[PDB]
């Protein structure tokens, strides 16, 4: 299945089209020369501005190392990971095909082909950095969702998340590190020609199936689940604090209504709204924070029994003893709750904007990876059917199914895999 112009000496790990000792051509896989030049220039054009913006984010980190606390610290490791991603993807444009390609030799009648294996080549190091820091950036976004969860359900601060920072770094450089050592162990390194970098899941179907696309999908599922858990737990604790505030303000305002009122009628008509508010406030809610409302309701009861017996000033004296109980148990609890629940509102808004601005490029990359997963056999069959005479291999027997993949899809995949580093700048500036 491999031509004499594409054959390599064995036991070097070369495996293309499921046959040993073959490798895809370097300059042209199926695209045009001018189209490839435009794609390379476009990749360099996004790469330079991505490197500039991400270096601005890292310089903002360098001007003050303690500027960002650990509830938002993982965004700067996100930034440094994607700055290394953009740096490698710019090195790909600058070096063209001098690294992620083998050289031709007319004397041996061989053509330029994709480096695939160990050899003695920096493509190994390029794969290490690119795969490691891409997976690391995704895991760091997962860790940011985790840190928001720790600030949502088991509400912590910038101290308890610091005490778990060693384990966070262990994960965020362990799953990418172990996956990188696994892929380097199984000899599944490959090489790009469109961009100029080296990556896994390019010309092998399974490597893109369950070593690139599946981990990113798992990360997205975990992150969206934790984000939704945080949103639900924050808007349950917000409206349950909203009604308790409404029940308490309809108790404080009504207590003022009682105090400056006359007659034996409106004292009962106002206290009857106090008792209704107190019972609903007890249901919200810790044992002392329910026993307090229990002794408040009985205090309204003692005020309400005096009002029914036509004693107006005694209800004034009975209601004014509710002010001591309010201060003694609650009324510091609210502004402490309305601050811890409104910096969490703005943190939730920022993390929602960051998620909705980073996930969409990530979801586009996932979609294009799925598209390259689906039609691999059809694309290779069209390659073989179109490229038959000049390679002298036998032509396919049947099933043409002509389908040349579009430059738009792959350029989108290489576009949204680099714009993800832009999402840090919004939090930086």
């Amino acid at each position, epitope marked *: 299945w491999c031509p004499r112009e594409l054959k390599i000496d064995p036991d070097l790990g070369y495996s293309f089209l499921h046959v040993r000792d073959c490798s895809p051509p370097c300059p042209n896989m199926y695209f045009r020369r001018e189209e490839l030049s435009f794609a390379r220039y476009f990749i360099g054009l996004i790469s330079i501005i991505c490197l500039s913006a991400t270096l601005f984010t890292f310089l903002t980190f360098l001007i003050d190392v303690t500027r960002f606390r650990y509830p938002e610290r993982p965004i700067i490791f996100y930034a440094v990971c994607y700055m290394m991603v953009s740096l490698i993807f710019f090195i790909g444009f600058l070096l063209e095909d001098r690294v992620a390609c083998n050289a031709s030799i007319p004397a041996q009648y061989k053509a330029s082909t994709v480096t695939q294996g160990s050899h003695n080549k920096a493509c190994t190091m390029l794969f290490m950095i690119l795969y490691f820091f891409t997976m690391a950036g995704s895991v760091w976004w997962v860790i940011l969702t985790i840190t928001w969860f720790l600030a949502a359900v088991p509400k912590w601060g910038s101290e308890a998340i610091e005490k778990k920072a060693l384990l966070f770094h262990a994960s965020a450089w362990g799953i990418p590190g172990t996956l990188t050592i696994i892929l380097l162990a199984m000899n599944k390194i490959e090489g790009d020609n469109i961009s100029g970098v080296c990556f896994v899941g390019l010309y092998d179907v399974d490597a893109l199936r369950y070593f690139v696309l599946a981990p990113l999908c798992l990360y997205v599922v975990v992150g969206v689940s934790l984000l939704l858990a945080g949103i639900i737990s924050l808007n349950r604790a917000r409206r349950q604090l909203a009604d308790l505030e409404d029940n308490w303000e309809t108790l404080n305002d009504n207590l003022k209504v009682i105090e400056k009122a006359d007659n034996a009628a409106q004292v009962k008509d106002a206290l*009857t709204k106090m008792r209704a*508010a107190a*019972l609903d406030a007890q249901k919200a809610t810790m044992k002392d924070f329910r026993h307090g409302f229990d002794i408040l309701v009985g205090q309204i*009861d003692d005020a309400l029994k005096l009002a029914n017996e036509g004693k107006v000033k005694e209800a004034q004296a009975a209601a004014e003893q509710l002010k001591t109980t309010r201060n003694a148990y609650i009324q510091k609890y609210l502004e402490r709750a309305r601050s811890t629940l409104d910096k969490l509102v703005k943190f939730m808004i920022r993390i929602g904007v960051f998620s909705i601005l980073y996930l969409v490029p990530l979801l586009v990359v996932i979609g294009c990876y799925f598209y390259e997963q689906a039609y691999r056999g059809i694309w290779e069959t069209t390659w073989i059917q179109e490229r038959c005479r000049e390679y002298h291999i036998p032509c396919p027997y049947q099933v043409t199914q002509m389908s040349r993949p579009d430059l738009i899809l792959f350029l989108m995949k290489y576009l949204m895999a680099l714009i993800v580093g832009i999402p840090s700048v919004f939090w930086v500036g």
Partner: antibody
Amino acid sequence: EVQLVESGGGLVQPGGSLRLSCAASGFNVVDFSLHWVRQAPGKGLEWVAYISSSSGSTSYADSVKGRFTISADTSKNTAYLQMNSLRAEDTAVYYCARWGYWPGEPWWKAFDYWGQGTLVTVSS
Amino acid sequence: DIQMTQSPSSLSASVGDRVTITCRASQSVSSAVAWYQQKPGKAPKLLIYSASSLYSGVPSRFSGSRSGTDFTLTISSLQPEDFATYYCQQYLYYSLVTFGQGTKVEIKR
């Protein structure tokens, strides 16, 4: 088993007076409040009186204010309701109910045990 | 003063059906409503208290719900013995007890 028995109903003239009795077996009247609720023939329930034997916290409804009187005895474990100057629309069947005290489940439990309820009519 | 408007003044449901009775409170009475059953000729027996809790003795067919100032009694299965009058009571205080107008659940025919 805890139970309530009502007695005293019968035929009375307009403007007359009658005394109903509600006796409790089981619980004590000091640990529960006793309410009287009346049901007119062919109509719904309306609350007419209540008593708290722990301290005395009597209050009635607006239809019978200044016209009815309620009391209780802890020695005989009974609650009495007296009506003076009965109007013709006070004919009903009267029910005795038990309601707990704050806090906890006894108050949140509403009228739990009801008596048989006895019928009083105004004999024109 | 607090008025309970019990909307379906007469229901006609058959055996095994699902019965929904609603009750609207004028003021913001808390989750203190009680649903009562009265057979013709006898005294009321408590069915539901605190707008959600089933009484110890009544079948698990009955259930209660609260939505703000609206209160609902749902009977999931309607046995032939569950053909009586059903009343809605608000108890915000001892001296404020006002009942609803009542719903007579009759047999559909």
